[PDB]
Design an enzyme around this catalytic site. Structure first.
Site, PDB file in Angstrom:
ATOM      1  N   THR A   1     -26.796  50.039  21.530  1.00 34.44           N
ATOM      2  CA  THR A   1     -28.192  49.729  22.314  1.00 34.44           C
ATOM      3  C   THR A   1     -27.682  47.894  21.881  1.00 34.44           C
ATOM      4  O   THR A   1     -27.008  48.186  20.500  1.00 34.44           O
ATOM      5  CB  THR A   1     -29.142  49.850  21.600  1.00 34.44           C
ATOM      6  OG1 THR A   1     -29.968  48.992  21.600  1.00 34.44           O
ATOM      7  CG2 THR A   1     -29.716  50.733  20.481  1.00 34.44           C
TER       8      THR A   1
ATOM      9  N   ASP B   1      -7.753  46.402  26.554  1.00 35.99           N
ATOM     10  CA  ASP B   1      -9.273  47.358  26.861  1.00 35.99           C
ATOM     11  C   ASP B   1     -10.089  45.529  27.889  1.00 35.99           C
ATOM     12  O   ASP B   1     -11.043  45.718  28.349  1.00 35.99           O
ATOM     13  CB  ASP B   1     -10.681  46.990  26.481  1.00 35.99           C
ATOM     14  CG  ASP B   1     -11.275  48.272  26.882  1.00 35.99           C
ATOM     15  OD1 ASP B   1     -10.730  48.451  28.394  1.00 35.99           O
ATOM     16  OD2 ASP B   1     -12.547  48.453  27.544  1.00 35.99           O
TER      17      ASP B   1
ATOM     18  N   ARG C   1     -15.621  43.987  33.308  1.00 38.05           N
ATOM     19  CA  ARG C   1     -16.406  44.380  32.417  1.00 38.05           C
ATOM     20  C   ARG C   1     -16.805  43.636  31.552  1.00 38.05           C
ATOM     21  O   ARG C   1     -17.150  43.599  30.656  1.00 38.05           O
ATOM     22  CB  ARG C   1     -16.789  45.892  32.413  1.00 38.05           C
ATOM     23  CG  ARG C   1     -16.012  45.954  31.439  1.00 38.05           C
ATOM     24  CD  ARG C   1     -15.500  48.006  31.577  1.00 38.05           C
ATOM     25  NE  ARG C   1     -14.966  48.186  32.555  1.00 38.05           N
ATOM     26  CZ  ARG C   1     -13.715  48.941  31.777  1.00 38.05           C
ATOM     27  NH1 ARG C   1     -13.509  48.689  30.200  1.00 38.05           N
ATOM     28  NH2 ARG C   1     -12.577  49.097  32.668  1.00 38.05           N
ATOM     29  N   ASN C   2     -15.529  43.360  30.928  1.00 36.00           N
ATOM     30  CA  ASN C   2     -15.086  42.714  29.269  1.00 36.00           C
ATOM     31  C   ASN C   2     -14.999  41.218  28.977  1.00 36.00           C
ATOM     32  O   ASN C   2     -13.968  40.454  28.205  1.00 36.00           O
ATOM     33  CB  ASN C   2     -13.962  43.548  28.853  1.00 36.00           C
ATOM     34  CG  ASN C   2     -14.056  45.487  28.853  1.00 36.00           C
ATOM     35  OD1 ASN C   2     -15.721  45.619  28.040  1.00 36.00           O
ATOM     36  ND2 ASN C   2     -13.907  46.059  27.964  1.00 36.00           N
TER      37      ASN C   2
ATOM     38  N   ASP D   1     -15.367  42.353  23.853  1.00 36.80           N
ATOM     39  CA  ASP D   1     -14.915  44.352  23.777  1.00 36.80           C
ATOM     40  C   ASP D   1     -13.705  44.596  23.070  1.00 36.80           C
ATOM     41  O   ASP D   1     -12.622  44.645  23.090  1.00 36.80           O
ATOM     42  CB  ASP D   1     -15.277  44.665  24.999  1.00 36.80           C
ATOM     43  CG  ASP D   1     -15.384  46.490  25.183  1.00 36.80           C
ATOM     44  OD1 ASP D   1     -14.570  46.734  24.273  1.00 36.80           O
ATOM     45  OD2 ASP D   1     -16.591  46.212  25.210  1.00 36.80           O
TER      46      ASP D   1
HETATM   47  N1  LIG Z   1     -22.987  39.141  23.502  1.00 34.73           N
HETATM   48  C1  LIG Z   1     -23.233  39.610  24.537  1.00 34.73           C
HETATM   49  N2  LIG Z   1     -24.338  38.834  25.254  1.00 34.73           N
HETATM   50  C2  LIG Z   1     -25.162  38.998  26.381  1.00 34.73           C
HETATM   51  N3  LIG Z   1     -24.979  40.684  26.663  1.00 34.73           N
HETATM   52  C3  LIG Z   1     -23.705  41.115  26.142  1.00 34.73           C
HETATM   53  C4  LIG Z   1     -23.193  40.924  25.091  1.00 34.73           C
HETATM   54  N4  LIG Z   1     -22.275  41.308  24.498  1.00 34.73           N
HETATM   55  C5  LIG Z   1     -22.291  42.903  25.478  1.00 34.73           C
HETATM   56  N5  LIG Z   1     -23.904  42.880  26.083  1.00 34.73           N
HETATM   57  C6  LIG Z   1     -23.663  43.826  27.266  1.00 34.73           C
HETATM   58  O1  LIG Z   1     -24.530  44.725  26.574  1.00 34.73           O
HETATM   59  C7  LIG Z   1     -24.065  45.842  27.250  1.00 34.73           C
HETATM   60  C8  LIG Z   1     -22.964  46.622  26.888  1.00 34.73           C
HETATM   61  O2  LIG Z   1     -22.117  46.250  26.426  1.00 34.73           O
HETATM   62  P1  LIG Z   1     -20.934  46.639  25.088  1.00 34.73           P
HETATM   63  O3  LIG Z   1     -21.051  46.770  24.417  1.00 34.73           O
HETATM   64  O4  LIG Z   1     -19.129  46.059  25.505  1.00 34.73           O
HETATM   65  O5  LIG Z   1     -20.867  48.972  25.749  1.00 34.73           O
HETATM   66  P2  LIG Z   1     -20.912  49.084  27.221  1.00 34.73           P
HETATM   67  O6  LIG Z   1     -19.225  48.590  27.221  1.00 34.73           O
HETATM   68  O7  LIG Z   1     -21.404  48.059  28.323  1.00 34.73           O
HETATM   69  N6  LIG Z   1     -20.793  49.986  27.978  1.00 34.73           N
HETATM   70  P3  LIG Z   1     -20.120  50.959  26.774  1.00 34.73           P
HETATM   71  O8  LIG Z   1     -18.588  50.842  26.322  1.00 34.73           O
HETATM   72  O9  LIG Z   1     -20.672  52.671  27.598  1.00 34.73           O
HETATM   73  O10 LIG Z   1     -20.938  50.680  25.918  1.00 34.73           O
HETATM   74  C9  LIG Z   1     -23.067  45.721  28.460  1.00 34.73           C
HETATM   75  O11 LIG Z   1     -24.104  44.712  29.229  1.00 34.73           O
HETATM   76  C10 LIG Z   1     -23.007  44.154  28.332  1.00 34.73           C
HETATM   77  O12 LIG Z   1     -22.384  42.879  28.999  1.00 34.73           O
END
Ligand SMILES: Nc1ncnc2c1ncn2[C@@H]1O[C@H](COP(=O)(O)OP(=O)(O)NP(=O)(O)O)[C@@H](O)[C@H]1O
Ligand SMILES: Nc1ncnc2c1ncn2[C@@H]1O[C@H](COP(=O)(O)OP(=O)(O)NP(=O)(O)O)[C@@H](O)[C@H]1O
Lengths: 297, 297
Positions: free
Chosen positions: B26, B137, B141-142, B155
């Site tokens: 989350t 990675d 998406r990252n 990421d």
């Molecule tokens: N610094 C940030 N600011 C805004 N949104 C973010 C930030 N970091 C992550 N997110 C968003 O939060 C959600 C989860 O990000 P993340 O921790 O990379 O997991 P994920 O790769 O999107 N999915 P998963 O690997 O299954 O947990 C996605 O919408 C990300 O783009």
């Protein structure tokens, strides 16, 4: 205490070409074309004339400092060329020094630009503080303009890196710009990051007055006295009390009471968010050219 | 071989507040208010749920990598909070991941934006290469969006720093995104800066197609075969041969024949100078809020 592993690039005379003069010490505008690189990098070449072992000693020391810094708000030294007179090759800053730039464009300079420059200069200075480097010559003339939205600090001719345990620097002789110096510097030739803060203040004042000369018409000789009585530069007409208060704080007699560059970044960033609330201004072939900022060899 | 003197800031639970959910692992949107600092920093808080010694082990490793990087095009880790579940506190990237951003704004994305993002990502990646770090990675998406003109790589969950003499990394097990991997990775679980280049290529392809899924409808199982026959992703309709050629070069079987990030910065910068010649697109109280980029403690 840490090893300075910066690299010093030696450039071949035949690798770059001088296109025109920018000053006359002499500085030229030109292009650097690293052999077999397929790029053309706009540069400023500073050569200097009648070779003097004393003069070569100085520029090499400047080259040393410049080669050791790497920040978006500090001038990038590309390399040196070992010709009869050693020339420093830097990134060309198309728009020249900021002092001349605010003078030439007063009528087109908004509050957003002024505050952003303040932020950028503070970032460059904070970066130098981290590198335990004391500029000793911060002034609007020593800030260059890459683009109107991007300036960089330059002129490391007086710069001094500090020893691992050296808390301050005690100069000996030499003419240092008096109107930009902290009081402890003028009286005891002592310099620190906190004395750079004082010069940051004057620099901001030069910007806010669109290029006015500080203490205009006042013999540098008297300066030390004026500052002792408690007198300081006046509040620029466009400055709200918020901005001037910051300047004044940079001119406190107690070095440790003056703000830290990291704080100056925070304050000016906040103001840059709503510029009009803090400054009140009426009306507010080159196919392979690559900027030095994008050329990382 | 050099000592990593990066600092790891431990944040108090009471110092920041979660304002709303951004995902559900989350991630929350919120504000960090360093006590007695007089600033409010927008942040993303990633907490994770049922505490598992295995899961805590992973996020601490991500915190370690993130705390060790400092570049304008790499996500900034502000600190961690040691609550039952360890939470990572990062700089909030208002616009979310780039993949979703190009999908949501296709009709408003010009050639200038696409090329600038390519440049920024290459700068972030070149910086990681300098820090001898292999992302493993890299994907659209990252990459996150601070502003439409400023993205940062994120990421670091798979990221691996290399040993002083370690030229490449040999993974063991674990699911890594197949459609973004170099061929040497899929076949021999070998990773390098050059395999990051291959993923850079796919990432650029994802951007140029405005968010298309690579090898859509093709079992990941088959991928290794397809790439061996010599097949690759197709030329995006908006791409001139110049841009596609770069992508293809990132997908060469010989790792050393693929371009270097430093070169990708140069090429895309040149194209960014005249965007239309390289991509053909039809139509081409928060008083104390301070961005983390301006908060240097
Ligand atoms: N610094 C940030 N600011 C805004 N949104 C973010 C930030 N970091 C992550 N997110 C968003 O939060 C959600 C989860 O990000 P993340 O921790 O990379 O997991 P994920 O790769 O999107 N999915 P998963 O690997 O299954 O947990 C996605 O919408 C990300 O783009
Ligand atoms: N990188 C650069 N790009 C463009 N102009 C520059 C650059 N560096 C210096 N200049 C300009 O070249 C001229 C001389 O600069 P500089 O080497 O700092 O000497 P100065 O402080 O201006 N005068 P002086 O100290 O008497 O030689 C001034 O117009 C500078 O602003």
């Amino acid at each position: 205490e840490a090893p300075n592993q910066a690299l010093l690039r030696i450039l071949k005379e035949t690798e770059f070409k001088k296109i025109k003069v920018l000053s006359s010490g002499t500085v030229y505008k030109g292009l650097w074309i690293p052999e077999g690189e397929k790029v053309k990098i706009p540069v400023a070449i500073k050569e200097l004339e009648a070779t003097s072992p004393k003069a070569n000693k100085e520029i090499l020391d400047e080259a040393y400092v410049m080669a050791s810094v790497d920040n978006p708000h500090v001038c990038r030294l590309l390399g040196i060329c070992l010709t009869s007179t050693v020339q420093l090759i830097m990134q060309l800053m198309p728009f020249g020094c900021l002092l001349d730039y605010v003078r030439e464009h007063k009528d087109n300079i908004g509050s957003q630009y002024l505050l952003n420059w303040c932020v950028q200069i503070a970032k460059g200075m904070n970066y130098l503080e981290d590198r335990r480097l004391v500029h000793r010559d911060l002034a609007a003339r020593n800030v260059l303009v890459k683009t109107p939205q991007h300036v960089k600090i330059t002129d490391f001719g007086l710069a001094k890196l500090l020893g691992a345990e050296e808390k301050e620097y005690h100069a000996e002789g030499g003419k240092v710009p008096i109107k930009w110096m902290a009081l402890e510097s003028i009286l005891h030739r002592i310099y620190t990051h906190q004395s750079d803060v004082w010069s940051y203040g004057v620099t901001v004042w030069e910007l806010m007055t669109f290029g006015s000369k500080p203490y205009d018409g006042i013999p540098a000789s008297e300066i030390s006295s004026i500052l002792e009585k408690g007198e300081r530069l006046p509040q620029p007409p466009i400055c709200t009390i918020d901005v001037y208060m910051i300047m004044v704080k940079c001119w406190m007699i107690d070095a440790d009471s003056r703000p830290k560059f990291r704080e100056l970044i925070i304050e000016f960033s906040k103001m840059a968010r709503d510029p009009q609330r803090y400054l009140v201004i009426q009306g507010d072939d080159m196919d392979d050219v690559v900027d030095a900022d994008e050329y990382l060899i």
